[PDB]
Amino acid sequence: MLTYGAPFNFPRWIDEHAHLLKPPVGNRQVWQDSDFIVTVVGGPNHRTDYHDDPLEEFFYQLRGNAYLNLWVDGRRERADLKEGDIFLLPPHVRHSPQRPEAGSACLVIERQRPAGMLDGFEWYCDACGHLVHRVEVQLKSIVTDLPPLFESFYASEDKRRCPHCGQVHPGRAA
Amino acid sequence: MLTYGAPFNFPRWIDEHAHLLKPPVGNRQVWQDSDFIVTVVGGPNHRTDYHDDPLEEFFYQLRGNAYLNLWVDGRRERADLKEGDIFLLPPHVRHSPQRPEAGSACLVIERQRPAGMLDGFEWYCDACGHLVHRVEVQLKSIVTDLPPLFESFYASEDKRRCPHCGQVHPGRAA
Numbered sequence: 001m002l003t004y005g006a007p008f009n010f011p012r013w014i015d016e017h018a019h020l021l022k023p024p025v026g027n028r029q030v031w032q033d034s035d036f037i038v039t040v041v042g043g044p045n046h047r048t049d050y051h052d053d054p055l056e057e058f059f060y061q062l063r064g065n066a067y068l069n070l071w072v073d074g075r076r077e078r079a080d081l082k083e084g085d086i087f088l089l090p091p092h093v094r095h096s097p098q099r100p101e102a103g104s105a106c107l108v109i110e111r112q113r114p115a116g117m118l119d120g121f122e123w124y125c126d127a128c129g130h131l132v133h134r135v136e137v138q139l140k141s142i143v144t145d146l147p148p149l150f151e152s153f154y155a156s157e158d159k160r161r162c163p164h165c166g167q168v169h170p171g172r173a174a
Numbered sequence: 175m176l177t178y179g180a181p182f183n184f185p186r187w188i189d190e191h192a193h194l195l196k197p198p199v200g201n202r203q204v205w206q207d208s209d210f211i212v213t214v215v216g217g218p219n220h221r222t223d224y225h226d227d228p229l230e231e232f233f234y235q236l237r238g239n240a241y242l243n244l245w246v247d248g249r250r251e252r253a254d255l256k257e258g259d260i261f262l263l264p265p266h267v268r269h270s271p272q273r274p275e276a277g278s279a280c281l282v283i284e285r286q287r288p289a290g291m292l293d294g295f296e297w298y299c300d301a302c303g304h305l306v307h308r309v310e311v312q313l314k315s316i317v318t319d320l321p322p323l324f325e326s327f328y329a330s331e332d333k334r335r336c337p338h339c340g341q342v343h344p345g346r347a348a
């Protein structure tokens with residue numbers, strides 16, 4: 001049987017749920033309990049963290065523009081997701097999704113992580129560039145599991161303290 | 175490093191490769207050697223086979239319309255993929271993609287099958303409805319591996335012979 005229901009118009013779906021895409025992630029999962037985690041992400045979002053996904057991530061910026069702050073070969077790079085662009089991110093490439101425009105929508109598809117395969121969430125110092133804090137988690141929901149982690153980083157100067165130059169990461173207002 | 179390159183406009187990509195989407199599958203893979211097998215499928219295609227995919231399949235009919243002939247709970251059903259529709263197919267639900275219109279384009283995303291996880295390709299009798307022939311394969315390319323299988327079924331009346339009512343499946347002209 002069609003465990004996930006019948007086909008349906010995606011634009012309309014997005015229009016009807018536009019109001020539910022809210023910060024910090026701007027996340028919204030289409031189907032529940034599937035192997036393919038299919039989501040729509042809108043803006044304005046609020047991310048200061050770099051995600052280290054053990055699996056690939058597929059992107060398709062359907063509406064508006066956004067960009068990904070990356071760490072490619074040890075360098076802070078930027079990959080723009082112009083409306084209409086698709087992109088496949090290899091596993092583990094660190095990325096921080098910046099989606100500043102309202103009414104924006106990006107199709108993001110990922111995979112359920114097998115038990116034992118953890119996702120990493122990191123922060124880097126804006127001063128020396130050194131890694132400030134890393135949290136590894138067995139992710140069960142890219143929708144609900146994210147904010148709580150960010151909250152604990154923002155609420156702790158000890159976590160935000162760079163082990164290289166003692167500079168304390170801005171946190172919530174970064 | 176970005177093993178799969180930078181982001182790029184998808185519509186333009188589709189426009190520039192429209193001429194390469196040819197029967198019987200109408201297949202065209204976007205990125206090579208990735209875990210997520212991302213393809214675009216256009217028409218007119220030619221499929222008489224039902225695919226039994228051990229993993230989920232994501233669809234997003236970007237241009238034109240198409241439909242999926244299915245076997246849901248033992249019944250020949252039809253799921254229309256109207257332009258703009260997205261759909262997630264559970265593992266193993268038998269399906270036969272019908273894409274009759276030229277200039278059509280559907281984003282289809284699937285997963286690389288682990289070793290030992292085989293795909294099944296089946297044919298059913300238009301008379302009694304009984305299973306006529308099944309082939310299991312360790313799929314390495316949903317692009318190049320398909321036609322050869324279909325060819326061997328079409329070239330054999332023995333394979334096309336229904337084990338229930340001796341009716342011989344039409345084959346190439348079905």
Ligand SMILES: Nc1c(C(=O)O)ccc(Cl)c1O
Pocket residue numbers: 025027041051053057097099108110142
């Ligand atoms: N790429 C993302 C995004 C995004 O692109 O906005 C949001 C949540 C998660 Cl878990 C991601 O991996």
Ligand SMILES: Nc1c(C(=O)O)ccc(Cl)c1O
Pocket residue numbers: 199201215225227231271273282284316
């Ligand atoms: N759904 C498809 C399609 C399709 O939808 O046309 C083509 C090839 C393969 Cl291997 C598929 O699983």
Ligand SMILES: [Fe+3]
Pocket residue numbers: 051052053057095
């Ligand atoms: Fe991510």
Ligand SMILES: [Fe+3]
Pocket residue numbers: 125126127128129130162163164165166167
């Ligand atoms: Fe520092």
Ligand SMILES: [Fe+3]
Pocket residue numbers: 225226227231269
């Ligand atoms: Fe299939």
Ligand SMILES: [Fe+3]
Pocket residue numbers: 299300301302303304336337338339340341
């Ligand atoms: Fe028969």
